[PDB]
Design a protein around this nucleic acid. Structure first.
Ligand SMILES: NC(=O)c1ccc[n+]([C@H]2O[C@H](COP(=O)([O-])OP(=O)(O)OC[C@@H]3O[C@H](n4cnc5c(N)ncnc54)[C@@H](O)[C@H]3O)[C@H](O)[C@H]2O)c1
Ligand SMILES: NC(=O)c1ccc[n+]([C@H]2O[C@H](COP(=O)([O-])OP(=O)(O)OC[C@@H]3O[C@H](n4cnc5c(N)ncnc54)[C@@H](O)[C@H]3O)[C@H](O)[C@H]2O)c1
Ligand SMILES: [Mg+2]
Lengths: 469, 371, 101, 51
DNA sequence: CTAATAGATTAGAGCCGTCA
């Protein structure tokens, strides 16, 4: 017989200085942190896409209701929640004729067609940003469903163009990094989900009972990409810097090699949270070697420490380096000789591989979301997916898998490690959910590395997430 | 008399007052406030006195460092005290405490004997304090809204899949031969005391402890493979691992101890399958994984991973915790040998005994299961 | 904070209250009570409280059938109890007894 | 540290860079939607940067 | 250097479900 400890919920902060565990309830009752005046939207696409976008904008001005209110709170309309204006009167439209989309999508070569389509879409945005006077906050791209299905890694149709990945989204986001333009890509079927059907007279995607969820998600994304702050973490310990390492293989560049991209989070003076990326990939020629050479690791640590010191003025007292691989001695010794002496380095490996499953005896639901089985002083299991009493349901189907946390280098208290990991799952601005499955230090550090490896080297890319997500 | 009057200090306590007035209006009550309903160009003291005296059921006072010792607030309090005396309602006045800097020893002399409400910790807590008080006192709620105002009002021992290893053969001391054997140098490894191998103790230039544990794990895995081959259970080769399942008709009506391990889905059958991996961390166990495999006529599988994936997705959509748990436990009990264990043949006499019940976990926190 | 406060029912205990107040004044103790003290044209309920909270050393209470139910005397007693709790004084309140029924 | 080079060209370059780098950083890596950018130039910067 | 036997790790892709 073994023992399970339970970890309390972290709570997040909204307007008026009020707290809550659910983002939706906090946004509905108190509203966002900062105060925008409004969002001016730039739309690029066909006339069908312009009509669809205008209709959807009109749709989400009024309250929207879900089938089950307990599971998913209602949407009370955009302005009731966000205290700003985002209407179909701030639209500046740049038409893209259908002849171009038809004619470029004909070379039968994924790379050439993807490059041509991305160039076609981005040249208009670049020109509208350079040669015009109108002000645009977030640009919205409405791609027809027919080009989405053909621009994928493995896609077959039923000149510096080979240096990029053959995915529309990654290349499109990458090639706008040097102009710093926020953007939100939509699919015609995501907004006009009724009009796209199958052999039967039903939509392929049925949003009838989860329409308020889509409204919540789209509104939150649009409000974040316009320079807003919808919530923050209530309790973050002072003098603690969190990092994140992920390895993305740089496919098809003269050899099989792989890079590394990072993210950081800390509490700054003024009770603010600085959640921002850590850009500039660091490579190693070896194939299948997910590690850093000493020279490439000293640079990364120096960069992170200098950033924290510049914003705060003193070095972090504690630094936690979360990762999904295991460090080795050769690189960890590169650490600790750029680090000062008044700072603690702790390396935490987070994985979801070990197959442990827990079942309730004589029940029908799953295990709670705070439960953890502490195996040792350097190992533990944490359940980040499970039954949440507030929404009266679990965050997954079947039986969830636990998250295996293992202190790898340094010494730390495993209970505190779990407590800090659980609060890192509430900062998914790409989503409007109760909480995430894995820490966002590892999820946002993955998107940047996925977008940075689908283009040629670009010097000093932006750090803000709004240009990536 | 169905208007809730709100007394405050203007403009120092305007944010909280406006919040409270908007909330109470949303919930359905009628609220009169100095900043939202007073007219422009009207005699205001006379109108305020008329409102307090003629139509007022509750007198909610905002109490703070500003609203204390204010002439307008004090005059309103005096008139409200007269109305309370005339109306014989001991709960006509209700102070609301919102300022953390106002000590309870410095409150007005007119509210000393009154039970204030605390908004200092959280405003929703105080809001429900006042809502509970209103429910108890039966303040007239002009419910002119449906499905909106009521929604504003509304706003352990576990099992596992680990089978502990009860015993090991004493001494440690080609894959196509009868028993589990492993090549190593010019020697042969097959069933050094094993009590010390699994303690991080033995070390020698002949072999390292970690390598010895790895070899023991390999021997255990081969033994399990052979043992399930000797149980006459059909096998499915997954991408890297292997799974085992029972043929249709093998069990009595496809049921073992009131659990069903073979069933029906349209033009396909579904078979519950398991796979096993032996580990030595954190303690010697046999980890079990659950799978579903689909056979065309109940005996032959489908040579297509797409249809297998789609059917497996469809079948698990309705299953839940109890279904998976009971099916796994039933399969393990089916493989059980005598009463509580199940051996792996490691040699001429030696055996490794595995428990047929999973490891049990215990916690101290649960949920009320509100259906 | 050197004034004796006399709380009582009105107008039922004015005779005994006046006798006691005059005797105490004659013996040299500063006393207070509506008669001879309250000013005409003032906010009384709010002057019943200032004197109790800032200008009181002892709190005499004339108890009888008339008292121990009147709202005003109970309010004054509550404020007196709070002031006693603040002052950390054990003998703030002196319940005089003048009735027998 | 910039309006002291005594060469008009270099100090003009440095000051223009000092303002525009911040403007572009704010534009590319922040979540607001700024309609116009208002540049409050102290008097000394404008005074001597003439040809 | 080449070619097999395993245990223990990593990163990619592609398909399906979300309610009653
Ligand atoms: N929250 C409160 O303090 C509150 C509540 C109810 C009544 N009152 C009364 O007390 C207040 C005292 O105000 P003050 O002198 O301290 O500050 P002030 O007059 O500068 O500001 C107070 C506000 O001025 C306005 N006001 C005052 N006289 C007015 C008039 N003749 N015509 C139109 N608007 C007028 C009202 O909105 C009042 O609430 C006002 O006389 C009256 O509303 C105050
Ligand atoms: N400190 C004292 O000696 C003392 C004794 C008794 C009551 N009080 C106080 O308590 C009183 C209220 O309690 P109660 O209802 O039992 O008193 P009460 O019996 O005096 O009040 C009821 C009637 O109201 C009249 N009244 C109303 N306002 C008055 C005013 N401004 N001046 C004179 N008479 C007035 C009284 O004369 C009486 O006829 C008054 O507020 C005040 O006198 C003080
Ligand atoms: Mg996004």
């Amino acid at each position: 017989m073994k023992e399970l400890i339970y970890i309390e919920e972290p709570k997040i902060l909204f307007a008026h200085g009020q707290k809550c565990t659910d983002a939706r309830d906090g946004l509905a009752l108190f509203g966002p942190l900062n105060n925008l005046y409004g969002i001016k939207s730039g739309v690029i696409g066909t006339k069908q896409g312009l009509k669809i976008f205008r209709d959807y904008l009109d749709h989400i001005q009024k309250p929207i209701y879900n089938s089950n209110s307990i599971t998913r709170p209602m949407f009370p309309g955009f302005e009731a929640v966000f205290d700003c204006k985002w209407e179909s009167t701030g639209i500046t439209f740049k038409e893209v004729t259908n002849e171009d989309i038809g004619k470029f999508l004909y070379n039968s070569s994924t790379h050439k067609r993807t490059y041509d389509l991305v160039s076609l879409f981005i040249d208009k945005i670049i020109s509208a940003n350079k040669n015009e006077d109108e002000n645009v906050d977030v640009w919205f791209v409405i791609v027809p469903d027919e080009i989405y299905k053909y621009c994928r890694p493995n896609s077959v149709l039923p000149a510096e163009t080979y240096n990029y990945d053959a995915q529309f989204h990654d290349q499109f986001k990458a090639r706008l990094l040097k102009h710093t333009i926020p953007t939100q890509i939509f699919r015609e079927s995501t907004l006009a989900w009724r009009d796209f059907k199958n052999a039967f007279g039903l939509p392929i995607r049925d949003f009838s009972k989860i329409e308020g969820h889509l409204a919540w998600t789209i509104s939150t994304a649009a409000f974040y990409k316009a320079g807003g702050k919808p919530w923050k973490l209530s309790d973050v310990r002072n003098g603690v810097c969190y990092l994140g390492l992920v390895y993305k293989k740089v496919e098809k560049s003269k050899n099989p090699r792989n890079a590394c991209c990072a993210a950081q989070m800390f509490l700054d003076n003024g009770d603010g949270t600085v959640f921002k990326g850590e850009v500039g990939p660091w490579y190693n020629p070896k194939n299948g070697q997910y590690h850093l050479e000493p020279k490439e690791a000293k640079a990364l640590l120096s960069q992170s420490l200098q950033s924290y010191k510049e914003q705060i003025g003193e070095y972090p007292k504690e630094v936690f380096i979360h990762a999904k691989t295991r460090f080795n001695h050769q690189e960890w010794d590169a650490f600790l000789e750029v680090t000062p002496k008044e700072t603690n380095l702790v390396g935490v490996t987070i994985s979801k591989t070990k197959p442990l499953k827990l079942y309730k005896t004589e029940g029908d639901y799953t295990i709670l979301r705070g439960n953890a089985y502490v195996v040792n002083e350097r190992s533990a299991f944490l359940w980040t997916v499970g039954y949440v009493p507030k929404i009266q349901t679990a965050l997954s189907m079947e039986v969830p898998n636990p998250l295996f946390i293992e202190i790898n280098k340094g010494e730390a208290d495993i209970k505190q490690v779990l407590k800090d990991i659980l609060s890192l799952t509430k900062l998914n601005y790409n989503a409007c959910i109760f909480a995430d499955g894995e820490p966002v230090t590892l999820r946002f550090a993955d998107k940047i590395g996925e977008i940075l490896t689908a283009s040629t080297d670009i010097k000093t890319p932006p750090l803000a997430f709004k240009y990536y997500i | 008399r169905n208007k809730i009057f709100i007394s405050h200090a203007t403009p120092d306590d305007n944010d909280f007052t406006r919040w409270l007035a908007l909330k109470l209006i949303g919930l359905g009550y009628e609220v009169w406030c100095d900043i939202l309903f007073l007219d422009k160009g009207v005699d205001f003291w006379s109108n305020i006195e008329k409102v307090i005296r003629e139509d007022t059921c509750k007198f909610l006072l905002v109490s703070s460092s500003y609203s204390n010792q204010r002439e307008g607030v004090l005059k309103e309090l005096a008139v409200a005290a007269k109305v309370k005396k005339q109306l014989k309602d001991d709960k006509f006045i209700i102070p609301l405490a919102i300022d953390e800097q106002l000590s309870y020893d410095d409150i007005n002399i007119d509210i000393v004997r009154l039970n204030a409400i605390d908004f200092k910790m959280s405003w929703a807590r105080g809001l429900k304090d006042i809502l509970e008080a209103f429910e108890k006192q039966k303040v007239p709620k002009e419910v002119a809204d449906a499905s909106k105002s009521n929604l504003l009002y509304q706003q352990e021992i576990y099992d596992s899949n680990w089978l502990s290893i009860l015993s090991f053969p004493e001494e440690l001391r080609v894959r196509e031969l009868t028993f589990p054997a492993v090549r190593y140098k010019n020697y042969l490894c097959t069933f050094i005391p094993t009590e010390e191998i699994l303690s991080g103790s033995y070390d020698s230039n002949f072999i390292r402890n970690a390598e010895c544990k790895r070899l023991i794990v390999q021997l255990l895995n081969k033994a399990f493979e052979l043992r399930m081959k000797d149980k006459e259970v059909q096998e499915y080769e997954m991408s890297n691992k292997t799974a085992y399942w029972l043929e249709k008709g093998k069990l009595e009506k496809d049921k073992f101890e009131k659990t069903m391990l073979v069933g029906k889905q349209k033009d396909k059958n579904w078979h519950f399958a398991i796979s096993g991996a032996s580990k030595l961390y954190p303690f010697p166990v046999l980890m079990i994984s659950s799978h579903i495999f689909f056979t065309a006529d109940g005996k032959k599988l489908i040579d297509s991973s797409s249809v297998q994936h789609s059917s497996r997705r469809r079948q698990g959509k309705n299953w839940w915790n109890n279904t998976w748990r009971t099916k796994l436990l039933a399969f393990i009990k089916y493989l059980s040998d005598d009463d509580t264990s199940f051996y792996l043949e490691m040699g001429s006499e030696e055996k490794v005994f595995v428990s047929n019940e999973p490891v049990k976990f215990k916690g101290n926190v649960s949920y009320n299961i509100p259906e």
